[PDB]
RNA sequence: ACUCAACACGGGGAACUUUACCAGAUCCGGACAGGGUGAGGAUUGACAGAUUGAGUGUUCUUUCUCGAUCCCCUGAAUGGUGG
C-alpha cells in the first residue's frame, strides 16, 4: 500500500462505522467494552492529553488482542469520520473533538490492509 | 360416522345456491342424500334508543337478523367431502362442516 | 415564584472512572470497592451509606 | 430511549405501517414478525415527529393509525441508515 | 352462528370506512368480500380503477398490507382486487364525491348540483335528489333543496332501490352538508309495487 | 368497562353479544348487517 | 333539559375507575432544534437518606446506571367531558 492509502483506508472504515452501528463512541462506553472484545480495531488519538489515556488504551488493546492504530490529532480524527455541520459560508458550525472511538466492523480491503500492519498484535 | 353439512349465513339467497344445487352433486352421485328439513332460525333482536339526548319522547328501535341454519344429511363420504365443501364460493359466511 | 419539584441537578461523574486497571509496570486497582456477583460484568461498583454497599444496576445487599 | 432504536429499524422492509392509539402500551406490528417490545405511546411519537416534516403520511380510520411512507420518507430512511435500498414499497412485491 | 354474522359485520364495517374516507375521488362505489375457501377475494368497487392499483403498484399493495397487519392475515389468505363499475351515474356515493369536488373547489352550488342532475338523468334514471343543506349565508343553516324526475319513499321497498350518500365538506366559516340519493332505473329485488300491465 | 371505539367511557357502552356500537351509535354507524323491518 | 316535543329522561342501576367538579401530585402530550449544551450536560434509570398522603425515584443529597432522542431559548404545537 501507499502513504496514502493507510490514512485513507483508515479513514473509509471510521466514515462507514460512524453512519451505521459499528462504532462504539465515549470514554467510559469504550473502555469497558474492550474489556468483552466487542472491538476488533481501534483508533486513539494521541493529543488527547489526558492522564494515562494513551498509556492504558495501548495496554488494554494489548491485553485482549484487540488491533490499535495511533493518530495525530482528536480533531483531525473527527473530522475523518465526518461530522462538519455546514454553515452557508463553508465555515464549521460546530466541531467536535473525537477521542474514544472502536470500531467493531470492517471492510474487506481495510482488513486486508490491517494485516499489512498488524499492529498491535 | 355419518357426515352433516350444516351451512350457516346471515342471508337466504346464498345458502339457497349451496344445498339445492350444488347437493345435486352428491345426490346419488357418489354418495346418497337424506334430506330432513332445516333447522330452526334463530333471531338476534337488538334494542337502540333513536335519540342522542334526553329530549325525544323516548324512543327505542327493534333491528332483527335472521339466522339461517341449513342442515341436509349424507350417509358416510370419506375423502369425497373434499368436493363437497370446495362447491361453494358464492357468498360470505358460507362454513361447512364434516363429522 | 415556586416551581416546587424539578429542578437541574448537574451530578454524576466528571472525568471519573475514566478508565480500567491501570497498567504497565503491574496493575494497580480501581476507585471505588468491587462488586460481588454482578450481571453486567464487575465494571459496576457498589455506594458507600451506611455501612452498606449497594449496587445501582444489579441491586444487591452487600456490606463492608 | 434505547427503546427508539426498535422502531427506527421497524419503518424499514415492513412497507406500510400500523399502530393502535393507546394510552397503555403493546405492540404495534405484526405483520413484519421482528418482535420487537415496544409501547405504543414510544411508536406514535416517533411516527408524529417525522410526519412533521412531511416524510410520512398519515391515514386514520376509528382509532387506528396506519402510517404509509412516502417517497420522499423512504429515501430519508435509507439515509438515516446508510443502507441503501431499491425502495421498501417496490421491494416487496 | 351468533358471533360469525356479527364479526362479518365488523370486518366489513372497519373495511369500508377504512377505504371510504382514505381512498376517495375515485368514483368509489364500496367493496364487496366473499369467501374461495382460505382465502378472500374483497373486489373493490371504483370507477376509475387506475388509482386503486396504483401506476407504481404501490397503492393495492398498501391496502392489502393494512388489512394483514391488523388482522393477522397473511398472503395466499387476503387478496384485493379492483372492478370497472361503468356510469358513474348510477352509484351515489361516487356523484356523491364529485360534487364534494366541484364545492370544495368553490364553485357556485346551483352549477355544481347541475351537473350531477345531468349525468345521473342523462344515462335513464327515474329520479334524483341533491338536498344540500349547511352555510350558503351566514347567518341560516340554510337549506337548498333540488329534485328532479320522481322517488319515492313509501314502504320499505324503497331502501334497496334507492342507496344514498351523505358526506361532508369543509370550508371557511364551518362545515357544509351535502347528500345525494339517486332512484336507479333498475330494481335490486326485480319488484315493483306500481303498475300492473296486461300482457297483450 | 370501556370501550375499543371511543376512549370516552362515557355516553354508554354496549357489551351485548360482544360488540360496541354506542359510543359511536348503530343508526350514524351501521353496516353490520342489522335492518329494522318490524 | 323545564306547558305539550322537562322531570325511573341524557340505554345516566354513577362510590376507586368512569369525571365534568373538589382536595393534591404528575406528564410532555412542549412534537417539531431552525438559534445552545455530545464524551463529563440541563439527562435515561437508580439502593439508602430526604421529599411527601404515597420507599413513590417525581424531586433533593449520596453514589451508581447513561442512550446524547430526554435538556436549554424562541417560534411552532397538540390535546380537552370548556363556552
Redesign the interface.
Do not use: L
Given at each position: 500500500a501507499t502513504p496514502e492509502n493507510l490514512e485513507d483506508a483508515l479513514r473509509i472504515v471510521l466514515q462507514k462505522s460512524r453512519e451505521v452501528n459499528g462504532l462504539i463512541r465515549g470514554l467510559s462506553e469504550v473502555a469497558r467494552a474492550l474489556d468483552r472484545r466487542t472491538a476488533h480495531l481501534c483508533v486513539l488519538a494521541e493529543d488527547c492529553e489526558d492522564e494515562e489515556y494513551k498509556k492504558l488504551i495501548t495496554a488494554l488493546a494489548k491485553q485482549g488482542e484487540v488491533d490499535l492504530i495511533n493518530v495525530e490529532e482528536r480533531e483531525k480524527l473527527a473530522q475523518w469520520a465526518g461530522l462538519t455541520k455546514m454553515d452557508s459560508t463553508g465555515e464549521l458550525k460546530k466541531t467536535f473533538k473525537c477521542s474514544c472511538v472502536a470500531v467493531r466492523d470492517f471492510g474487506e480491503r481495510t482488513r486486508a490492509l490491517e494485516f499489512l500492519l498488524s499492529h498491535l498484535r | 360416522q355419518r357426515v352433516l353439512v350444516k351451512m350457516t349465513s346471515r342471508n337466504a339467497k346464498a345458502v339457497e345456491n349451496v344445498m339445492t344445487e350444488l347437493l345435486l352433486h352428491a345426490r346419488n352421485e357418489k354418495v346418497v342424500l337424506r334430506g330432513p328439513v332445516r333447522l330452526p332460525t334463530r333471531t338476534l333482536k337488538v334494542t337502540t334508543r333513536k335519540t342522542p339526548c334526553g329530549n325525544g319522547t323516548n324512543t327505542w328501535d327493534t333491528y332483527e337478523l335472521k339466522i339461517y341454519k341449513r342442515l341436509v344429511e349424507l350417509r358416510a363420504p370419506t375423502e369425497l367431502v373434499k368436493k363437497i365443501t370446495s362447491f361453494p364460493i358464492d357468498a360470505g359466511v358460507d362454513v361447512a362442516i364434516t363429522i | 415564584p415556586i416551581h416546587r419539584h424539578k429542578l437541574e441537578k448537574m451530578r454524576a461523574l466528571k472525568y471519573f472512572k475514566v478508565t480500567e486497571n491501570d497498567d504497565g509496570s503491574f496493575k494497580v486497582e480501581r476507585t471505588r470497592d468491587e462488586c460481588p456477583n454482578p450481571v453486567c460484568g464487575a465494571g459496576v461498583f457498589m455506594a458507600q451509606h451506611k455501612d452498606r454497599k449497594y449496587c445501582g444496576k444489579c441491586h444487591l445487599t452487600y456490606a463492608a | 430511549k434505547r427503546s427508539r432504536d426498535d422502531v427506527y429499524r421497524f419503518f424499514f422492509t415492513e412497507g406500510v405501517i400500523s399502530c393502535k392509539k393507546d394510552p397503555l402500551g403493546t405492540w404495534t406490528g405484526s405483520l413484519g414478525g421482528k418482535t420487537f417490545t415496544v409501547p405504543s405511546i414510544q411508536v406514535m411519537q416517533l411516527m408524529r415527529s417525522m410526519k412533521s416534516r412531511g416524510l410520512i403520511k398519515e391515514q386514520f380510520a376509528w382509532r387506528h393509525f396506519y402510517w404509509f411512507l412516502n417517497d420522499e420518507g423512504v429515501e430519508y430512511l435509507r439515509k438515516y441508515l446508510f443502507l441503501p435500498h431499491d425502495a421498501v414499497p417496490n421491494t416487496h412485491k | 352462528?351468533?358471533?360469525?354474522?356479527?364479526r362479518?359485520?365488523?370486518f366489513?364495517?372497519?373495511l369500508?370506512?377504512?377505504l371510504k374516507?382514505?381512498l376517495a375521488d375515485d368514483g368509489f362505489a364500496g367493496v364487496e368480500?366473499?369467501?374461495?375457501?382460505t382465502r378472500?377475494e374483497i373486489v373493490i368497487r371504483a370507477t376509475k380503477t387506475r388509482e386503486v392499483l396504483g401506476e407504481?403498484?404501490?397503492r393495492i399493495?398498501?391496502l392489502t398490507?393494512?388489512l394483514?397487519?391488523?388482522f393477522?392475515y397473511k398472503e395466499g389468505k387476503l387478496q384485493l382486487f379492483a372492478e370497472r363499475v361503468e356510469v358513474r351515474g348510477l352509484s351515489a356515493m361516487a356523484q356523491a364525491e364529485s360534487l364534494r369536488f366541484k364545492l370544495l373547489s368553490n364553485l357556485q352550488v346551483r352549477r355544481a348540483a347541475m351537473g350531477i342532475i345531468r349525468h345521473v338523468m342523462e344515462s335513464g334514471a327515474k329520479g334524483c335528489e341533491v338536498t344540500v343543506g349547511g352555510k350558503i349565508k351566514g347567518q341560516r343553516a340554510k337549506s337548498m333543496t333540488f329534485r328532479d324526475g320522481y322517488m319515492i319513499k313509501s314502504g320499505?321497498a324503497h331502501k334497496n332501490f334507492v342507496d344514498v350518500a351523505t358526506r361532508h365538506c369543509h370550508l371557511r366559516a364551518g362545515t357544509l352538508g351535502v347528500k345525494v340519493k339517486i332512484m336507479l332505473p333498475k330494481s335490486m329485488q326485480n319488484e315493483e309495487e306500481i303498475l300492473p300491465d296486461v300482457i297483450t | 368497562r370501556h370501550c375499543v371505539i371511543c376512549s370516552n367511557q362515557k355516553a354508554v357502552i354496549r357489551k351485548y353479544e360482544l360488540n360496541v356500537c354506542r359510543q359511536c351509535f348503530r343508526e350514524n354507524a351501521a353496516n353490520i348487517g342489522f335492518s329494522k323491518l318490524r
Open positions: - | - | - | - | 352462528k351468533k358471533r360469525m354474522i356479527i362479518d359485520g365488523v366489513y364495517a372497519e369500508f370506512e377504512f374516507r382514505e368480500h366473499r369467501v374461495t375457501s378472500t407504481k403498484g404501490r399493495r398498501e398490507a393494512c394483514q397487519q391488523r393477522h320499505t | -
